[PDB]
Amino acid sequence: GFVGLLLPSLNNLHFAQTAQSLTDVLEQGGLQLLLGYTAYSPEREEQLVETMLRRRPEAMVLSYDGHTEQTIRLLQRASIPIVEIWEKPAHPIGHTVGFSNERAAYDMTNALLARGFRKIVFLGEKDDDWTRGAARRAGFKRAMREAGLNPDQEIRLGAPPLSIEDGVAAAELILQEYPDTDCIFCVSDMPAFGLLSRLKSIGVAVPEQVSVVGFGNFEVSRFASPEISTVRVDPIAIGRETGSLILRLLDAQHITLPPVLEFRPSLKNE
Amino acid sequence: GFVGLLLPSLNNLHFAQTAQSLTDVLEQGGLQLLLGYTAYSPEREEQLVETMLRRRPEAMVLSYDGHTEQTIRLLQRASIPIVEIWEKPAHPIGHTVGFSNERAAYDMTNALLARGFRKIVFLGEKDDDWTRGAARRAGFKRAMREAGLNPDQEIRLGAPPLSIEDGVAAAELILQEYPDTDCIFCVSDMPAFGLLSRLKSIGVAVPEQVSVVGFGNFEVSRFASPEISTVRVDPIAIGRETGSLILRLLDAQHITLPPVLEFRPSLKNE
Numbered sequence: 001g002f003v004g005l006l007l008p009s010l011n012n013l014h015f016a017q018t019a020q021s022l023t024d025v026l027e028q029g030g031l032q033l034l035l036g037y038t039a040y041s042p043e044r045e046e047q048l049v050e051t052m053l054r055r056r057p058e059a060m061v062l063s064y065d066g067h068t069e070q071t072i073r074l075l076q077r078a079s080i081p082i083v084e085i086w087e088k089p090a091h092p093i094g095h096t097v098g099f100s101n102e103r104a105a106y107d108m109t110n111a112l113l114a115r116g117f118r119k120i121v122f123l124g125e126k127d128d129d130w131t132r133g134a135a136r137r138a139g140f141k142r143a144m145r146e147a148g149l150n151p152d153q154e155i156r157l158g159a160p161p162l163s164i165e166d167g168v169a170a171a172e173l174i175l176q177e178y179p180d181t182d183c184i185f186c187v188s189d190m191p192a193f194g195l196l197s198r199l200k201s202i203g204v205a206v207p208e209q210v211s212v213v214g215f216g217n218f219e220v221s222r223f224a225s226p227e228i229s230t231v232r233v234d235p236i237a238i239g240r241e242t243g244s245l246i247l248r249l250l251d252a253q254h255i256t257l258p259p260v261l262e263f264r265p266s267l268k269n270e
Numbered sequence: 271g272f273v274g275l276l277l278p279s280l281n282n283l284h285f286a287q288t289a290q291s292l293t294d295v296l297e298q299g300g301l302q303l304l305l306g307y308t309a310y311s312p313e314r315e316e317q318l319v320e321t322m323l324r325r326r327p328e329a330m331v332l333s334y335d336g337h338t339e340q341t342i343r344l345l346q347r348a349s350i351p352i353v354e355i356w357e358k359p360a361h362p363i364g365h366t367v368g369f370s371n372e373r374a375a376y377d378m379t380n381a382l383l384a385r386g387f388r389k390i391v392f393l394g395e396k397d398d399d400w401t402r403g404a405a406r407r408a409g410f411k412r413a414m415r416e417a418g419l420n421p422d423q424e425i426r427l428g429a430p431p432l433s434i435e436d437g438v439a440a441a442e443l444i445l446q447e448y449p450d451t452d453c454i455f456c457v458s459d460m461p462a463f464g465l466l467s468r469l470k471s472i473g474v475a476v477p478e479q480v481s482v483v484g485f486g487n488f489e490v491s492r493f494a495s496p497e498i499s500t501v502r503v504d505p506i507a508i509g510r511e512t513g514s515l516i517l518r519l520l521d522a523q524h525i526t527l528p529p530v531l532e533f534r535p536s537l538k539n540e
Binding site (some may be wrong): 002007008009011012013015016019020023032033034035036038039044047048051052055163164165170190193194197200201217220223224225 | 272277278279280281282283286289290303304305306307309317319321325380382385428433435453463464467470471489490492493494495
């Protein structure tokens with residue numbers, strides 16, 4: 001029959017590649033994917049879960065960005081494999097395939113501190129409770145706190161998922177709040193690209209005055225000028241591991257795909 | 271009940287916005303949206319149509335890029351509203367919501383000719399029979415043919431959908447085959463952005479040496495430097511009109527949302 005997949009975005013390279021590889025693997029066990037689009041609404045996620053569960057999916061896969069209490073209960077009670085992907089939640093319902101978003105941002109922030117950056121500012125989302133962006137902010141804050149530096153050194157705007165346009169809006173805001181910033185670490189590559197576009201427009205040198213770092217290795221990071229330093233992930237592997245896990249189970253596991261820090265010319269001295 | 275939506279991409283702003291507005295309208299009417307991901311494959315589309323129809327959706331919405339004969343038969347024999355979106359097919363099964371891709375590309379090409387560009391090259395896909403990209407090529411060719419110009423001024427690579435990375439690879443193919451080109455009209459903004467990135471890398475001035483024009487008003491077109499001239503579409507309206515049509519039918523129509531040409535600094539004199 002089918003496996004359900006819930007996603008918060010239909011405009012995301014990672015989820016597209018995850019779905020493609022997951023599709024390919026499941027086709028080998030005779031299964032199709034049925035998708036639900038939540039648009040970041042935990043309430044809509046709940047409604048979609050209830051609807052799908054009624055149709056008796058063989059497994060459920062959810063891209064993690066927080067759940068309602070009732071969603072957790074419905075999934076726990078379903079007696080089928082549950083897989084949460086793209087994050088290691090504090091309290092996994094069943095299996096997970098992904099990595100710690102908190103740890104990834106902590107590691108990147110530490111790499112930037114090690115490279116001698118003196119005034120790093122995090123750019124993230126408003127109204128992002130329980131999402132992957134909130135975990136990234138948390139990892140940044142932990143790194144700054146451990147370094148004796150200022151964890152409040154951050155700007156929040158928009159909503160999940162921060163856009164290129166939001167990055168454009170953030171440029172002046174960051175420079176207003178932290179004029180001496182030498183590095184901006186963004187919640188993903190999308191606002192990083194917008195930030196880069198606006199800094200170039202206003203004549204701020206990147207990276208000579210301000211360095212720019214994103215997250216995700218989305219396409220824009222590789223084709224921007226300069227190319228944007230980022231945290232590289234493996235969406236094909238996430239889809240394949242998730243598919244393989246499901247087929248094994250139907251013939252709790254926590255499977256880690258370690259991110260890679262990708263330093264490119266948008267970071268000074270790289 | 272639910273409505274089924276089949277889409278070829280999970281990395282596409284248009285389809286994301288369509289799904290979001292379609293979701294909003296349907297939810298207000300008590301219906302949910304469930305998705306099938308085709309990955310531009312007519313064979314996967316057929317397999318998804320066959321299983322989804324058996325789950326008894328209230329209506330089926332198909333993002334149009336051509337169908338197998340079997341898919342057509344399955345949809346013809348259904349006694350539920352069928353809506354093909356994002357293109358006006360030559361032979362619609364039921365209802366449509368979208369616009370003529372052929373006419374849109376013909377219109378843009380004519381606008382370029384009116385602006386004095388002569389050596390326009392279309393950048394498009396291989397293995398794209400029956401898809402929206404093929405329609406765009408046809409519109410470009412008709413414009414060139416009617417103007418008494420050479421319609422065989424084009425480069426084909428990759429597969430639907432042409433990517434940013436494909437645009438990068440196209441730069442050298444185009445300049446090798448057509449060294450005198452003054453304007454490249456790409457099948458969408460995505461290869462246009464890649465093309466722009468590569469031309470900037472190698473030192474070809476846009477628009478002074480070569481102008482670049484895309485299709486779809488994707489986010490990169492608005493924040494690239496220079497901003498990318500494009501064909502602006504209305505995905506919110508497409509999703510809204512599709513949802514509203516379905517609810518009216520449940521209580522043939524051809525709903526037309528004419529695109530708008532957007533001229534930006536990637537076009538000489540704009």
